[PDB]
Ligand binder design. Structure first.
Ligand code: PEB
Ligand code: PEB
Ligand code: PEB
Ligand code: PEB
Ligand code: PEB
Ligand code: PEB
Ligand code: PEB
Ligand code: PEB
Ligand code: PEB
Ligand code: PEB
Ligand code: PEB
Ligand code: PUB
Ligand code: PUB
Ligand code: PUB
Lengths: 164, 162, 181, 172, 177, 164, 177, 177
């Protein structure tokens, strides 16, 4: 699970040395950017339900054909799997946002996704519609602090650029 | 002789083509810097004798053994002083020729070509001459672009000698 | 009409003086922004399709709730919907470009602020250069030859660390070359 | 071989477009800079032999290695080859100062020179010290307020310095 | 593989002295301009596949003989590797934006690529076209002047940073030609 | 006009001495802060007209009684004088913002303002309503970066504390 | 009393318009040339005591009738007031170098001076000669070309400043005549 | 009345010595810049009626109290006089452009102006506004940047000369105030 401290410990471990001052500066930067990350994590755990609700609502506001032909989530159950999947996604954005690297988001969500969305006839463009709605909606000084909003946007963009 | 015009024509002649716009622009620019060059040539021609006399006095004050050293090459004889102002007069005249031509042609074909064998075979050190050209560079008393011209060609003779 | 009006901050720039320089391009842009025959509120957009009745070509709009994008350009819902008794003037983030009036490419536009920068190994010095000091000592050596100027000739001898004056190296100092030594 | 103008035209043809008026305004600006350019090239061409000589004197004074027996510089032959190489580098830096592009220097002098000075056993860093000294003498000389009408020339000194820095960077 | 710090040190090592005041002053201006470099790299990284997609698609649409049978973009496999190549070039340019010196890009990817594209039969003018499109796109994202994305940041001037990034892309584009 | 230059030159002139290193450090500080303030002046000359509109419209949005009777705002013409005097004050904020001291805004706007405003029945509270509206409409991190905005705040503060 | 700043502001005030983008551009040149201005006035200030002595002694040497009986430098007192006036002229010129505008020199010293020296009998020709000597001496110190003093300063072109200082001295010498 | 030549001569006679090199050098520059001076004064003795018309008309339109009753441009007679005075001011400025020294302008026109306009009741600020409009119009004509008139001339930089002409108008406008 990739973070600042796991990269530097794993790198010095691959080296075969005790941690020099470089790793110490890296973890110093971890404890500098920490406050903005954890603020974003607090607000995400605050309103996750309304975020996922707006995400799925806009995702079917864009693409109506998922419902139209039994070739997508046309049964209330499949749309419940839809909002569940976006729940998983915001949960992984919260986890990578706490860790501060893209580690848990990559290994739990992104790694091996392509076989799953490919095999199970799941379109990625609809996911991207959901995330880009939750991305376009955000205001930096309206709710989140500027530094935390940046962190949030960055992580969500990572999800988009890892998806398609 | 190496004039800008003859460089232009000689290059186009070696290529066998005509004198297209490149060389014509070259002759234009020569015709513009030519005026300052001519003014500088006028004033060097004006005060030649005091430049030569002054330059020989500077060489004699810088190297005082030369008037004292008994020999053919040194300026102890009256003959030696005549050859002294003779040679300084040569350098001044070749500088005025290069000011008129606009390139270093006459100095490179009348003076620079073969100067080493002469300064060796008569044991004339390059440095004595350098001091002469420094006094000419100080006392020519031109101003502005004309002064940049004469300082250009005189400095050029200095960098030939060393 | 629905009047798609860009903000002041988005309007100004180099392409702005291009449009003030040309009547043709300016006319085509102003006709590109304005729709005829419809009055549209912010919440009446609703979907992703095209618009025909325009000069340039069909306009792509993506309408989702508020996150409205017009030609890929978002509109600002702070000052989007205004009554004008005949229409409504919706304000846009950017400039909608025609396929008619095409902007100049990057090589026609760009110049670097910092020169020679594809030729310099060191980015740190080139972007923040320090001032060059005096040059009197160095000019005294670069000017005249070695017999003309006497003592200065060494001039260019700068200062080595103390060990390099040492007996395996035996460096020289400028006081050695002078008559005073 | 390419100057400023040939580089602009060559890129403009590598994309195949014309020159915009922005490009043409840039060219006009560089032309108005061009008198100052010719002035710096004139100063270099004038005092060049004293530059090479004084810079070699400071080199042998600060590094007394090469003049001693078994030194790369050593022998009459080797000393003359040393001086001449410095004259070569100064000549092409005068050329790239005129062209405005660093192409002639790379094409005629720098590119492939490292393979030679490796192939002879010549210490590269000593050559680099030599070129740093000609940069100091040349830059200082270029900043002389004698004989020229007075004016602001920091950009041209910066560029000239980039050329010498490229020479010392290509030997080392 | 050298940053601004290492480059100064290497230069002061050939000079064989300590770092000194003038060099440290310029390096202090580097560190004070550090967060602009941070936000810059964040911009190019969070528009990566966007830049590569538009750039190579523009390269095909400008010169449509690449997708004609016989061109080097004629198969899915060739198009995938060409797309991948564009992504890797943008990747090491992003590293040269972090490090501040092009030592990582010169030593890693720029070295040997011209001769590889010669050995493959890749047309070099088309690659320099792709690099140029990534240059204009990348400077447009780095200055927040994209026509599809305008995110909010603190106001400031980064003309110097933009000239630096344009210097790296012109280094790659000049390096393949 | 009070600036850094005029205060130090005038103070050294009253001293009867040559300007020593203290005045030199003062003008050193002037050429340090110069860029931040001048960015503010450029942006003020950018959108001053909308500052007229929102300033005066908020000024009558608070006090409606001026448009009610004959007293100070009887006609549309006196409202044109209202917007007019607001643009005078913004032009003096541009001037003192360029100079960097409060000199021209003091000797042109503030000096003798109280006999005029008291004489012609002009209330200051509507001016203060306008200026407090302008400082409430400060777009710092998006329009006036940081310190340009700070200098603008300071000058407009001085306007209110002069009037109130 | 107006600096360069207040000169731009007063000129913009007359036309009842905002400062704008070109006047500020000329004032940006004032700011970027700031340290050279500082160092120049430092050069004028550091040697100011030396300049007045030399100029007045040169004024007497050019014109020996000042020291002659019933001349205005005859009595010891009169030589003292003479030295003081040279010092005050130098003083205001240095202020005009700091300000960048000659409002200080025009208002505080220059205005009503010809009629004063006429009313006191002070020879105008002599004063303008002394102002000319301070002019040449001041430009020589400001260009670091003085014989008795050559101090190190990092190099650059100071041509704009020298013409400025020469303009103030020519304003004084043209004012007494 | 003194030109540049008589200025050199007068300065050298105050010094009480021969003419020498350096003064003559500056005067050589005067001669080589002679034709630009000629063409500049020709540009101001060209559309000059146009200048005075536009400037006084601009002065009335900027300040409408002149044409108001009991203003100094009210009566038709008074308008004739103001136009005549605008003409004369531009005339002596043109003389100062030919001479190269402001001796003619100072002695013939400038000396009695402040007291005279006070003795007539002429508002001085309005006059200085009209001198400013003549200044800007004259510099635009002298730089070939007028909108209604763009006459082709052998090209060259002429900034020196523009600043010279602006120096004389500023001398007049500062003289009436
Ligand atoms: C003409 C006046 C001179 C000339 C002056 C230059 N000075 C340059 C730079 C520079 N000068 C100072 C000293 C100055 N600044 C201050 O704050 C104070 C006193 C409080 C003084 C007296 C500084 C600090 C600097 C910059 C930093 C540094 O050099 O370490 C300079 C370089 C160009 C520029 O910075 O604009 C020049 C040209 N130089 C000349 O050759 C003539 C003789
Ligand atoms: C895109 C603008 C080109 C083109 C690209 C193609 N590249 C192909 C092969 C290939 N490319 C590279 C360079 C790349 N590999 C690296 O490791 C790095 C940097 C670390 C870079 C920049 C290599 C080494 C190779 C050979 C190995 C491989 O096949 O991946 C390629 C396949 C060519 C073929 O098999 O015929 C293509 C098509 N496509 C184009 O249309 C333009 C010219
Ligand atoms: C840890 C993270 C994590 C995720 C992110 C999900 C991702 C995920 N989704 C599905 C599976 C699914 N996901 C969806 C969701 C969709 N319905 C649509 O209309 C939209 C396109 C989309 C919501 C936006 C649907 C409908 C299925 C079932 C697909 C099917 O069986 O046809 C599956 C296969 C197993 C299953 O059936 O549940 C997986 C792994 N699971 C995880 O473990
Ligand atoms: C954890 C992270 C996190 C966020 C980033 C926000 C994102 C967010 N914003 C809103 C909701 C909102 N957000 C805004 C903000 C805007 N007003 C505008 O003029 C601008 C376009 C923009 C500020 C830049 C507004 C106005 C609403 C309410 C929209 C409405 O009800 O019409 C909602 C729906 C719930 C609500 O009403 O609060 C959510 C999830 N919430 C979160 O939990
Ligand atoms: C075209 C260019 C050109 C020159 C530059 C001269 C150079 C020159 N000088 C001499 C010859 C000479 N030159 C000098 C001059 C000197 N006397 C001294 O005291 C000083 C060291 C020095 C003047 C600075 C003397 C004295 C001789 C005669 C030497 C002798 O016979 O001993 C000779 C040999 C022929 C002769 O005797 O004249 C030549 C070729 N001749 C040329 O044709
Ligand atoms: C067109 C461009 C061009 C160059 C730049 C030179 C480069 C160059 N130098 C040498 C050759 C040489 N170059 C030097 C120079 C050096 N002496 C030292 O003490 C220093 C390390 C260094 C000067 C800074 C020496 C000494 C030799 C002779 C080496 C030897 O024979 O041992 C040679 C081999 C041929 C020869 O012997 O001359 C070449 C090609 N030649 C060219 O044609
Ligand atoms: C054929 C060869 C050749 C040259 C060598 C130049 C030499 C030269 N330079 C200038 C002119 C000039 N040269 C410079 C240059 C300088 N700026 C400074 O700060 C430094 C002292 C110096 C650069 C090192 C400047 C500033 C001018 C303009 C001077 C002025 O107008 O004040 C002029 C007058 C014409 C003009 O304005 O361009 C000439 C002839 N011209 C030529 O035709
Ligand atoms: C770990 C990741 C990380 C980042 C991504 C940055 C992001 C970041 N940038 C700034 C701060 C800044 N960032 C910029 C950058 C910009 N200049 C412009 O012209 C453009 C819009 C933009 C470059 C594309 C500027 C100018 C500032 C300073 C803003 C100001 O002080 O006005 C700050 C505030 C602290 C500071 O002043 O440095 C932060 C946190 N910092 C981090 O720690
Ligand atoms: C240089 C700066 C500068 C200013 C700031 C103004 C200030 C100012 N305003 C007025 C004069 C006036 N100012 C107003 C303005 C007002 N109308 C109202 O309803 C509001 C309370 C208020 C606008 C917010 C009115 C109405 C008058 C005329 C008052 C009257 O004649 O009754 C006057 C007297 C002269 C005149 O009548 O114009 C002055 C000096 N003038 C200046 O020269
Ligand atoms: C008897 C009447 C009389 C005149 C009216 C002038 C006309 C005149 N001007 C120039 C020549 C010139 N005139 C100008 C003038 C300027 N160029 C600009 O771009 C500016 C707009 C303008 C500023 C004044 C310039 C720059 C030159 C060329 C440079 C020069 O010759 O000094 C020449 C040189 C010959 C030629 O060009 O053919 C002549 C004769 N001389 C006279 O004898
Ligand atoms: C040689 C130089 C020279 C001058 C500069 C003028 C200056 C001047 N103007 C006037 C006289 C005058 N000047 C003006 C001009 C003015 N009208 C206004 O509205 C403005 C304030 C101003 C123009 C800007 C007017 C109106 C008169 C007549 C005044 C009167 O009779 O009331 C007079 C008195 C004689 C006369 O009536 O003509 C003089 C000496 N005359 C000269 O010989
Ligand atoms: C029909 C075949 C075709 C394409 C594919 C495009 C490709 C393309 N993009 C460009 C250039 C370009 N592309 C982008 C990136 C892009 N824009 C954004 O706002 C976002 C979010 C992006 C990624 C999704 C930017 C930012 C620019 C710079 C121009 C601009 O300001 O938009 C340019 C101009 C190149 C130049 O200046 O030389 C081209 C040709 N053009 C075509 O004809
Ligand atoms: C016998 C009656 C007498 C004098 C008294 C002097 C006075 C004098 N000083 C001059 C000019 C002058 N004076 C100085 C200042 C002076 N020089 C220095 O190097 C130091 C340290 C100084 C103060 C101690 C300088 C720097 C100059 C400029 C000339 C130069 O480069 O020295 C000039 C030339 C004026 C001009 O150029 O128009 C004069 C006349 N001359 C006289 O005939
Ligand atoms: C409504 C009341 C009124 C006027 C009357 C004008 C008067 C006027 N002329 C100006 C300035 C001005 N005037 C002219 C002269 C003029 N233009 C020509 O091309 C020809 C042939 C002319 C004489 C017939 C020139 C050349 C300029 C300079 C601007 C320009 O380039 O046109 C300026 C600008 C002043 C400045 O820059 O500070 C003003 C105010 N303006 C007004 O508001």
């Amino acid at each position: 699970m990739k973070s600042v401290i796991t990269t530097t410990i794993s790198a010095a471990d691959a080296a075969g040395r005790f941690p020099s001052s470089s790793d110490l500066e890296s973890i110093q930067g971890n404890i500098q950017r920490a406050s903005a990350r954890l603020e974003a994590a607090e607000k995400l755990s605050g309103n996750h339900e309304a975020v996922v609700k707006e995400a799925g609502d806009a995702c079917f506001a864009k693409y109506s054909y998922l419902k139209n032909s039994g070739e997508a989530g046309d049964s209330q159950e499949k749309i419940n799997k839809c909002y569940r999947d976006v729940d998983h996604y915001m949960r992984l954005i919260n986890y990578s946002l706490v860790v501060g690297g893209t580690g848990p988001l990559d290994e739990w969500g992104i790694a091996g996704s392509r076989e799953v969305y490919r095999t199970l006839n799941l379109p990625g463009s609809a996911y991207i519609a959901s995330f880009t709605f939750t991305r376009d909606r955000l205001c930096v000084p309206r709710d989140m602090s500027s530094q935390a909003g940046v962190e949030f946007v960055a992580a969500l963009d990572y999800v988009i650029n890892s998806l398609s | 002789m190496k004039t800008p015009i003859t460089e232009a024509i000689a290059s186009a002649d070696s290529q066998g083509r005509f004198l297209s716009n490149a060389e014509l622009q070259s002759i234009t620019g020569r015709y513009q810097r030519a005026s300052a060059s001519l003014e500088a040539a006028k004033q060097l021609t004006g005060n030649a004798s005091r430049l030569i006399t002054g330059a020989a006095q500077a060489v004699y004050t810088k190297f005082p053994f030369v008037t004292q050293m008994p020999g053919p090459t040194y300026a102890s004889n009256a003959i030696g002083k005549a050859k002294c102002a003779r040679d300084i007069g040569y350098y001044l005249r070749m500088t005025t020729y290069c000011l008129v031509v606009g390139a270093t042609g006459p100095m490179d074909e009348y003076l620079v070509a073969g100067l080493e064998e002469i300064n060796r075979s008569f044991e004339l050190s390059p440095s004595w001459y350098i001091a002469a050209l420094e006094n000419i560079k100080n006392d020519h008393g031109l101003s502005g672009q004309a002064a940049n011209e004469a300082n250009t060609y005189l400095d050029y003779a200095i960098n030939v000698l060393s | 009409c629905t009047v798609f009006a860009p903000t002041n901050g988005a309007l100004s720039g180099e392409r702005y003086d291009e449009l003030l320089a040309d009547p043709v391009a300016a006319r085509n842009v102003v006709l590109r922004h304005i729709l005829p025959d419809q009055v549209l509120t912010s919440k009446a957009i609703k979907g992703c399709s095209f618009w025909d009745s325009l000069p340039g070509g069909p306009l792509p709009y993506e309408g989702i709730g508020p996150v409205v994008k017009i030609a890929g350009v978002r509109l600002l819902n702070e000052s989007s919907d205004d009554e004008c008794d005949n229409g409504t003037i919706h304000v846009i983030d950017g400039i909608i470009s025609t396929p008619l009036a095409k902007p100049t490419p990057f090589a026609g536009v760009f110049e670097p602020s910092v020169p020679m920068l594809e030729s310099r190994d060191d980015i740190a010095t080139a972007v923040y250069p320090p001032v060059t000091p005096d040059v009197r000592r160095a000019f005294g050596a670069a000017s005249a030859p070695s017999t003309v100027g006497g003592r200065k000739a060494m001039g260019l001898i700068k200062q080595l660390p103390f060990w390099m004056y040492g007996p395996p190296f035996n460096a020289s100092k400028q006081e050695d070359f002078e008559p005073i030594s | 071989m390419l100057d400023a103008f040939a580089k602009v035209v060559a890129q403009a043809d590598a994309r195949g477009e014309f020159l915009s008026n922005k490009q043409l305004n840039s060219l006009e600006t560089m032309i108005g800079e061009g008198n100052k350019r010719l002035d710096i090239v004139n100063k270099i061409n004038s005092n060049a032999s004293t530059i090479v000589t004084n810079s070699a004197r400071a080199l042998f004074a600060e590094q007394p290695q090469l003049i001693q027996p078994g030194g790369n510089a050593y022998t009459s032959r080797r000393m003359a080859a040393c001086l001449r190489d410095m004259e070569i580098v100064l000549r092409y830096v005068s050329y790239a100062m005129t062209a405005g592009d660093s192409s002639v220097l790379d094409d005629r002098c720098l590119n492939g020179l490292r393979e030679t000075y490796q192939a002879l056993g010549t210490p590269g860093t000593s050559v680099a010290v030599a070129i740093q000294k000609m940069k100091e003498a040349s830059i200082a000389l270029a900043n002389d307020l004698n004989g020229v009408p007075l004016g602001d020339c920091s950009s041209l000194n910066s560029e000239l310095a980039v050329y010498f820095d490229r020479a010392a960077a290509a030997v080392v | 593989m050298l940053d601004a710090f290492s480059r100064v040190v290497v230069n002061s090592d050939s000079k064989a002295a300590y770092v000194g005041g003038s060099d440290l002053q310029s390096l202090k201006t580097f560190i004070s301009d550090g967060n602009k470099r941070l936000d810059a790299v964040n911009c190019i990284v969070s528009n990566a596949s966007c830049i590569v997609s538009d750039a190579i698609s523009g390269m095909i649409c400008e010169n449509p003989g690449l997708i004609a049978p016989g061109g080097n973009c004629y198969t899915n496999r060739r198009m995938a590797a060409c797309l991948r190549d564009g992504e890797i070039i943008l990747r090491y340019v992003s590293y040269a934006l972090l490090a501040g010196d092009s030592s990582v890009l010169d030593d890693r990817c720029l070295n040997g690529l011209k001769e590889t594209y010669i050995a493959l039969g890749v047309p070099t003018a088309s690659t320099s076209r792709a690099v140029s499109i990534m240059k204009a796109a990348s400077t447009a994202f780095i200055m927040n002047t994209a026509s599809g994305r305008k995110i909010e940041i603190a106001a400031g001037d980064c003309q110097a940073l933009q000239s630096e990034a344009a210097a790296y892309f012109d280094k790659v584009g000049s390096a393949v030609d």
